[PDB]
Amino acid sequence: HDLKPTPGSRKDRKRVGRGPGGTDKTAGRGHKGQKSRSGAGKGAFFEGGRSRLIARLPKRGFNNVGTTYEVVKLSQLQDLEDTTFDRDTLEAYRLVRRKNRPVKLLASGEISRAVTVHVDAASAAAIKAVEAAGGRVVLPE
Amino acid sequence: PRAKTGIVRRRRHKKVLKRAKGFWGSRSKQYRNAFQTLLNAATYEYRDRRNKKRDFRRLWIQRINAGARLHGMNYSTFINGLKRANIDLNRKVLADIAAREPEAFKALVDASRNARQ
Amino acid sequence: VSKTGRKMYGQKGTGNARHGDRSVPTFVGGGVAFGPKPRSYDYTLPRQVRQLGLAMAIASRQEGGKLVAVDGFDIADAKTKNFISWAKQNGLDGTEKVLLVTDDENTRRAARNVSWVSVLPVAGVNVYDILRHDRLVIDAAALEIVEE
Amino acid sequence: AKHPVPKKKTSKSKRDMRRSHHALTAPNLTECPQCHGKKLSHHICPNCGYYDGRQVLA
RNA sequence: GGUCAAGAUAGUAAGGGUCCACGGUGGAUGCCCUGGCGCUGGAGCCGAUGAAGGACGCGAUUACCUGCGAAAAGCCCCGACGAGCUGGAGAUACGCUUUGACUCGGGGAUGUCCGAAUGGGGAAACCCACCUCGUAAGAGGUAUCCGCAAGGAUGGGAACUCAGGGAACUGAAACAUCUCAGUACCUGAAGGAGAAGAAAGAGAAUUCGAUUCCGUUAGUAGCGGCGAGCGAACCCGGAUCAGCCCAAAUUCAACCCCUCAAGCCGAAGUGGCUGGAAAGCUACACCUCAGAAGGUGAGAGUCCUGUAGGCGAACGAGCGGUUGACUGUAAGGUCGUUGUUCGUGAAACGAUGACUGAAUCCGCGCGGACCACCGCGCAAGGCUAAAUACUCCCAGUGACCGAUAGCGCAUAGUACCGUGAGGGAAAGGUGAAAAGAACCCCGGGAGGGGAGUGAAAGAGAACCUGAAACCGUGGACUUACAAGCAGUCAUGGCACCUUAUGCGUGUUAUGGCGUGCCUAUUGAAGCAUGAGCCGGCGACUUAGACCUGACGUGCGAGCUUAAGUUGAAAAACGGAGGCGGAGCGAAAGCGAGUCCGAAUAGGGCGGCAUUAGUACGUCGGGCUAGACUCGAAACCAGGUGAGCUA
RNA sequence: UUUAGGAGUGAAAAGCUAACCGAACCUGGAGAUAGCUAGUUCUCCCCGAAAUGUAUUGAGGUACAGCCUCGGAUGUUGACC
RNA sequence: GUCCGGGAGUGAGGCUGCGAGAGCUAACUUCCGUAGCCGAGAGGGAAACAACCCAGACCAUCAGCUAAGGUCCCUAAAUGA
RNA sequence: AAGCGAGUUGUCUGGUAGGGGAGCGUUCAGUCCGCGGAGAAGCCAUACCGGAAGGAGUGGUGGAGCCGACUGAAGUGCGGAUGCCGGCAUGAGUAACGAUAAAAGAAGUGAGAAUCUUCUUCGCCGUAAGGACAAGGGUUCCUGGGGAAGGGUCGUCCGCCC
RNA sequence: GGACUCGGUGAAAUUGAAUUGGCUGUAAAGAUGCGGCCUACCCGUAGCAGGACGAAAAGACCCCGUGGAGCUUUACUAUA
């Protein structure tokens, strides 16, 4: 044993790809002027560009408070073979069950099948879809 | 962390001190006139075995010029006599050989001399 | 880190003072400013790959010895002697490394060395010990290969 | 007040050819009038104490 | 052979140089039990029956230290355990033994000048009155504050909360609102816990109770020379999801799960070699819940201290459990402004400068001024331990250093710098062990001989190995009549031949000529500058969902924080949560399509001859920070002498 | 022996506070910060420049674009004749 | 022919040709653009010497020819017509 | 099972801020069967190979360990920052021994003595460079004793050191 | 009395490195290692200044620097 080898138990298993690069440490290799010593590189803190211009000029438009923007349920793979797991309570897979801020409707049209939903919505988007798919009316707030 | 290279940077200086040849005073274990004189031995040293042809070029242009003038000779305005045989081509080194047998231009004179008409 | 006085000699006189207190990694006897602060190691490691990544450590490690058992039956209580010596009915007393798991904590602590075997049990699985002992042998009749 | 400082030095190379224009005159010339051998540059023993006649003392 | 002759040109080179051998005060690597950094878990000061720490104090000497100063290496007791000798000039000696010399665990005591010390003086080691005592000598003591007539308290503190507390270099590329912030400093408090903490409350669907921290949001709203910039509440975890206070419980003790040093045992065989007994070559058993570091000349389970098994009193705390001596239920407001995220103005809310002490109960405090309606809380004073945030000490623990490295201290912050508070070194190492050494020499001696010591004295009684500019000598070779810091080759030239093989090793008159490196430079080769050398330090990185992006992978419907349980790894459990997501629009809201208005014609979008992705890591630039370091005179808080000129 | 720091002394010089005071020293606030400027460490394979213009209380300061490397791309559109 | 991006540089040059501007058409003075050159590479010619005539390289061979430059010498090459 | 090219043609240019890219090795860590007493690691030198950096052949000496491949981490590497300390330096043996206010010698001693000591001769101050009190140093003064070092010669003199 | 015979002690400011003669020329034109030419037997010490762009603090005269401090004026303005 130990005559003409080097290992004795794998771990030596390399890999089939990589991940790191070359890295840098800033101010290196014993050379390079590199970048501009004048303020930059160290600290700076304010951005590495001009300043606060062309920001000014506009008369500014308020109204940015949270209020409401809604999302969507995409409407495409829900009113087909989908039966029961989409009420306004159990539907919490893509942040739906999160109450308070409405979810409106927004669906297409035509519709060749139907489903059932604990809706709580009456948008004017999915007007071409609000019965065709199926599921009452019931306005809430 | 840590390293402490207060001993490893010895063989470094020496791995280049290989050229501690006969320089001056004691430029073989100097530590000044070493890693500098080495930078001095760092010039056309790179091309000091090719460019030298120019130096030994200063040989056959004194011999090949007009050795045995007892013939005719010209060298310069005679090279058109060289490449006037069947398959001349070759030239020097054969000049270095010309330093041996003097009969390298006996029946190799007027065998190119008037090899025009 | 030094914490000392301020002010200095003639910063601009005599022989290029370059003084003004001591705030550089020059003067021998201090620090270097900026570097290794304690650190607490902040990584999470995906929680998915674990109950299978282990299975992948059984890719070609399948050859590794594995089976089903309960401490020892051909013995009585506990006293570790001919109990471990039982591990001779297969050449397991100086030929490999032996993996250990079990579910007992009353007789599973009597083999701590520097180069020999390891031992820490919690009755579950651990990547920390999946190549350590060449023949992976869990087996407990209580917390065996259960995906649980 | 300082007059042009040292700057350039003169270690080896030179500082060699400086032990020859003086050195020591090298001697070993004479070896006393008659007995033993001291004498100096024309000057009596302390041995027999003499250049040729009575002088000095053992 | 010879008379003459030049031509040819030969050695020495006082001294030196190309090359080797023998070398220094200095000295790093390999390397060393204490000496440094980050830490878990506990513990967490005494207090006129007076503390931190210094000064001058004992052994036949005492000076840097142990204890203690005169009852100065220590005493009552119980007790460990031991029977021998009390710390560095380990001190020779002197002296004590096996029913208590020798070291000591805890409850006490002689306790010198200063510290609060305070009789007075009052510049630490030093001088006085006045009363009790008394063989003529000398013994008992003298200072302020609060129930006041004693007494009780105030001392010095390295990091934890506030409060009186308050600038400032910087940034905005300068530049008074500002960022630093309430930060440096001053002063007051107690426990090692105080600080907010049970309310005229947060939220908002027509809910929810006691503070704080971090987890996630929100890094949103706002703020704002409208500039950098600071930055809650809406939904979240646990430690905790516990009661009562001004006018109709605590104190000594028996028992105790239980901690604190002296301390008790604690495992299991050896021979032979190169050699220092080899734990390396080899051989077999025994010990096993206990097989981490380490000493004895070569890494040892059978030499030994830990680890698993468990014990210990006299004194006391310490986290205590049933109970004995006690009795456990009596102000909004105006004007000027500080804060709060809010630089103060388009806004209630803490409170102050002078003015108003109203309401007074279906009356009263506000939802960010006010109107209307709801929501909740009611003058009036505090306690609330638990976690959050701290780090003087006692075990144990870490991919650090290595005694100009690491705190300056691996026994020094010696001496001191000195005008003053205030600034300080440099420095380690002989082998296991000194056995650090009788015996004839030059010499004053230092230093050197013999020869043991020494396994090994090219360790060597200022001591490992021991590279180097400078520095010590000789030698094989060349050289003063030859010119350039230097160069490389080039024929020769003396030497050598670790392989006759007309082939090379150590080299030089001389030839082509040929000007250094760093490195802020259009620019040189410069006299443009930096450079005598040796040994090290030698910097854009470190934490930050700060972000974008290559590759490998996770998923296509995707990926997780806070610590709660496990706990020498973990981990699943976990939708707080944000990013991707149709969009556009000031937004509203709209809508798979969209702001225009009188609207087939147009820019963006779901769209789309369409990735809808995302997380970890090293990594392109950048970012919140001095965080590439350093070199400036100048602004400040505090404190120190004015014996310098006055 | 009190005066002291932004005050005193003073024969006025803008002299001195302890060998420099255009406002003492020392411990402390931040390293004054720095486009100034010295430097920013072992050895490399293939490619490659601006002092031109616009901006500036802006100039050897800095921003960007033509100007370099790389991932993807441009199925006929290149420059010469 | 054909854009999106991680990241530059350091803004202050010189000269011959091409022509003017301030100008005794004077100035490696100064402004401009246009080829080259040196800021990022060596030589022959040029006495050696950034843009001038010829020429820009993979390391090694005391192998050949072209252009400039030369055909008397110090160091090449016909005082050939 | 991590991708690799001869056969060949142009490019393989030289490259300053830069892009894609390889490594020599030391310290920390993995696996240590290990490598070392014929003694490795510390170091001094010999023409094998390598893209350079470097890896190689052996003794020398030295004394107890030390690195390896697959791997990640680390204050990973200029002689060169007019830096800083520690040591060697050279200005170089010259300028200088101090206020230019004379000294010779007999003799004691012993290691030789010119500057000690017993002493006859000389001269400088003597309102001094006298003695006491003031501040200061604290160990000066002595019985005296030894050169390691100091008194900028040194010395058998100190008020060095006991 | 120092410069020279002899005994001992001998440092600092500074500095890449000396086979360290010159011309005239050339070069960011103030060249000794560059060009082309001429020239010296090498070394030691006394002495002298033309010499290294003599030394020292990176001109502090000046300018550049969105540097500081200091004083004054009704400079913008705080303020006892």
Domain residues of chain D, as ranges?
Answer: 5-58
Residues 6+ apart with CB under 8 A from B68: B102, B105
Decide if C144 contacts C67 (C-beta within 8 A): no
Q: Both ends of chain C: CA-CA distance in Å?
A: 53
d(CA C102, CA B10): 57
What amino acid occupies position B34? A
Structure tokens at A114: 């139907």
Q: Is the CB of C12 under 7 A from strand I?
A: yes
* Number of independent structural domains in chain A: 1
d(CA B99, CA B108): 15
Nearest-by-CA chain B residue for D12:
B25
Give the CA angle between residues B12, B14, B20 to the nearest 5°: 150
Q: Is the CB of A31 under 7 A from strand H?
A: yes
Residues 6+ apart with CB under 8 A from B22: B28
Structure tokens at B32: 């000044």
Backbone torsions φ then ψ of A89, nearest 5 degrees: -165, -50
Nearest-by-CA chain D residue for B30:
D12
H or E segment and range at residue B11: helix B11-16
d(CA A39, CA A130): 62
Assess B26–D contact: CB distance below 8 Å, yes or no.
Answer: yes
Q: How far is D1 from chain B, CA to nearest CA, in Å?
A: 33
Q: What resolution in angstroms, rounded to 1 decimal?
A: 11.5
User: Which of these, B68, B57, B114, B117, lies nearest to B91 by C-alpha position?
Assistant: B57
What amino acid occupies position A41? G
Chain B CB contacts of D13 below 8 Å: 24-25
In chain A, how many H helices and how many E strands? 0, 0
Residue found under tokens 């993996």: C99
d(CA C8, CA B13): 39
**What SS3 class is residue C53?**
helix
Buried b (16+ CB within 10 A) or exposed e, A107-124: beeebeeebebebbbeee
Buried b (16+ CB within 10 A) or exposed e, D10-44: eeeeeeeeeeeeeeeeeeeeeebbeeeebbeeeeb
d(CA B62, CA B57): 10
Backbone torsions φ then ψ of B43, nearest 5 degrees: -140, -120
What amino acid occupies position C112? R
Nearest nucleotide to A35 by CA–C1' distance?
A: H17
SS3 content of chain B, % helix, strand, coil (to 5): 25, 0, 75
User: Which of these, D42, D45, D40, lies nearest to D57 by C-alpha position?
Assistant: D45
Residues 6+ apart with CB under 8 A from D25: none
Assess B22–D contact: CB distance below 8 Å, yes or no.
Answer: no
Other beta carbons within 10 Å of B103: 8
Decide if C111 contacts C87 (C-beta within 8 A): no
Distance A54 CA to F47 C1' (A): 38
- The method recorded for this entry reads X-ray
Chain D CB contacts of B24 below 8 Å: 13
What amino acid occupies position A95? L
Decide if B23 contacts B44 (C-beta within 8 A): no
d(CA C66, CA C140): 12
Q: Which domain holds residue A125?
A: 1-141
Nearest nucleotide to A41 by CA–C1' distance?
A: E540
Task: Count Cα neighbours of A120 within 13 Å in the Cβ-side half-sphere.
Answer: 14
Decide if A96 contacts A128 (C-beta within 8 A): no
